Amino acid sequence: MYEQLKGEWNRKSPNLSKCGEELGRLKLVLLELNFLPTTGTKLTKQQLILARDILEIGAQWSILRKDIPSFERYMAQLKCYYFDYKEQLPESAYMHQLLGLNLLFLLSQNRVAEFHTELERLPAKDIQTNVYIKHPVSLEQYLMEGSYNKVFLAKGNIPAESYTFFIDILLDTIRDEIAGCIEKAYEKILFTEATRILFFNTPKKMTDYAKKRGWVLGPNNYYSFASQQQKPEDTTIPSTELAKQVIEYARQLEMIV
Amino acid sequence: MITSAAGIISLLDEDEPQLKEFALHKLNAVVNDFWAEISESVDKIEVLYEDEGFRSRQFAALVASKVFYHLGAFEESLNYALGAGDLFNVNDNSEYVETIIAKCIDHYTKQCVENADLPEGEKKPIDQRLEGIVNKMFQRCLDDHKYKQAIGIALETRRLDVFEKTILESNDVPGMLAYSLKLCMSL
Amino acid sequence: PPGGGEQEPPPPPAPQDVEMKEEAATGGGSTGEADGKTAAAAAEHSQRELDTVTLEDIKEHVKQLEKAVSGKEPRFVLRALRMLPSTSRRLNHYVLYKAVQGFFTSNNATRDFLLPFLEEPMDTEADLQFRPRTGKAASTPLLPEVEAYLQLLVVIFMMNSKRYKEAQKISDDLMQKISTQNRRALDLVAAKCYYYHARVYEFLDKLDVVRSFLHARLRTATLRHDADGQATLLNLLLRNYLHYSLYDQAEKLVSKSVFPEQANNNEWARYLYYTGRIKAIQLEYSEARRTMTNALRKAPQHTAVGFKQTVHKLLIVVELLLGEIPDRLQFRQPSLKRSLMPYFLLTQAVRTGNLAKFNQVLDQFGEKFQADGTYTLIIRLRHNVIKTGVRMISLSYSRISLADIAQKLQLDSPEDAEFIVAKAIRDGVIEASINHEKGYVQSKEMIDIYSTREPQLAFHQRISFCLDIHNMSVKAMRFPPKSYNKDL
Amino acid sequence: MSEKKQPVDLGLLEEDDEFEEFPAEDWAGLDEDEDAHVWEDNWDDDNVEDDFSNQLRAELEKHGYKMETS
């Protein structure tokens, strides 16, 4: 309406310095354009879906610059256009994709419970013939399985699509959870399993986790301490609190009397 | 319009408040529909309420006060309600206004009773805007007085000069004084 | 034709006598009770009202009555109308107006005279004094009878009934607050009406207005309420949030409150069913399980056969997720059986834990549970089979074979075995000791209970809680006898 | 209220509209033998019966052949 805007839209610019000024300009224009959904005159669906698109690609740049608050911000803003009273709004092709990125965010932020409760709306039977649609639910299902082997073996199955790097980011943010769980060591473990489970010869884990967990290292073996070494009480204190409970019993049994 | 939309939260957590203004204005429309959505933004509202950075304290104070009696006790709501500073509100039949002025009056006369047995010393500070918003509705009900609650509220407020302007314009003065004493002897 | 014609008149006016007697006894009884003191008596006739409703819900009354039996619709209460005093002539008129239609015949209709039901409330409902309670006790009982048979273009007339109900009372109210027993009844009555046109709501269009304003109507009720009506109005909102919500960030833990005393011997069951259904999505093993099972063990009053069957289905469905699934034992009814018949084979097949065959078997004859939609809990269950299976392994012996048990679990590999086992260990739902010596992984796997091991700290909370329940049970044998001795 | 039981009952009526008295009789074949018997014990009975329904249903006669081989 105001101008073309299609010039710098489809164009991919590595530098986000100009994209930031363009973004701010878009904010200045959309400022009086009533971000909130409007059913008035019904002809505003064009500028609404246009704003939806530029906020979608804006979210693409937002996740390109790796901005956590901005991403969930634009996702919360686009969720307004995603959930609406009128069903006359056409379904975008990148809608389920960006929603998939939202699932990625929920998985990365350990919000995956909200993902589980979000699992209801996604099977809308709109397409279902695409592997990308069944990808996040199967990956999270494998996460419920806990097996990192299937993911690593199916890592080469991902097509030429460019979110593979974001999947690598997902592995990068879940690696502390996986390694954190496998290194728990209720009793003890042997290094021969560690060779298989842990990553390659690059000393990232043996460095970081050494200053993180702060444990002792023996002759090529991982030792675990503070396991079931906890000493019980002297039975004096729970006897006292039980006496207090007896007093409370005297109260409740006889108060009004 | 919006219900489960989390966008206004991100907008409330966002800088350059000039775009936050109309967002809060539209928030005041749906705040009656859903008060649970503002619950996560309550803390940030308090934060922006504390500092003097924002120009309008009443805009945040209203939202805080209305979401507080929806969430927690009426006390915390009344704190920001009476701490809203200068506020212009016309008389309405809505539940919110009548309830917050109900708690306002109740707590006012409560403090009056608490300060009744202490004529001198350790006097609690009393804001002028409170007396203003109280005496506004008080006078509004004191127009014709409706020959019932005038002397009642005049007595319940425990103020010395409050009932002197009530007897200025009245019908059947001896009857009004007799009714007044009859009301005063039964308390 | 001559036989059926001669036998035609007796059957249709069968319910008339006991129905007139019913409304006379209930109306005259309640009004004649609270007339002296309305504010004193509280919810004495309430249980009677809900009982009469639940009793009249199954009514077979109108079947062949569609033809000229509708003459009862135009006529109505007409008790002491247009004047407060001089009720004697009207006491005569009570017999008179009934005698008028009892001479020869009467002119009757169905869809002809409908809308002008608001004529009397425009001036005087009955006595010009008791109008709200007499008015609601007049209009509200006969409305579902006229609004019966929702289908066949009664939707528009139902909308007329809606706007009429609103405009006369519901829109806002006849006055600020009634603050009486008729109000305490008006809560559950208006709620019941909401449930009544709820079907009309969900039928075709959606909600842009009413239940959204029902929040303002809810808080218009003061916080000093017993929140019975508030909870009943919360039930319809929660049911409206039942099918599609998916946002747990607010109403979960925001909607939590002081939770005042409410029984009703219904609302507990249905609300626990609602919040149980909501809390069944995150698979809660501790709370949801026992509380929904208890909820199933509750509400004996009316029907556990046709109601509790759904919560029982959900119960066993969320039960088989733990690997141990109890079946139907103590309850014998020819409903839950047929309902669980297609699900019986697979829920019995859960303990076996065969991935390959049952993967095809489920989808083969699968109908209803896959008609639940979006394949959620089943796509969870498919890979939950191996977790319940490895849990069965945790309940099994320690030593793990590279061949035998690997073939039994249909999974053979050194890495994924110990890996998945470790994933079962990190859950914290079991007990195992990880040890590596010869390359084999053993476990202590002690399932032994708390007997003769830290007994005090073990059954402490049990003793405290059970004593609390027994003590509030003492309160339960305390207060009601006082409620008996209050009037004597 | 209890009025919410109506669509459920209608659903049951639909379930009865699917097939006419087929599962009634088909399961009556078993139930006639299961009649008058406690349904509490029938849980483990049906459990084992369905468990051995696939293979090794009897296995008692196979033990004698498994004596020399095992």
Place this chain on the structure above:
Amino acid sequence: LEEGKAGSGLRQYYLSKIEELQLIVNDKSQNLRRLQAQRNELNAKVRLL
């Protein structure tokens, strides 16, 4: 205006709810004093004994 017939009205109805709480106090005092009269009747009975 819309106060005396509104605010003072809901205040009087709040007072009616207060009358309900004091009605609970009332009949609690009633059954408590009836039980009191019962125990006093038995005590007077053994006094007659």
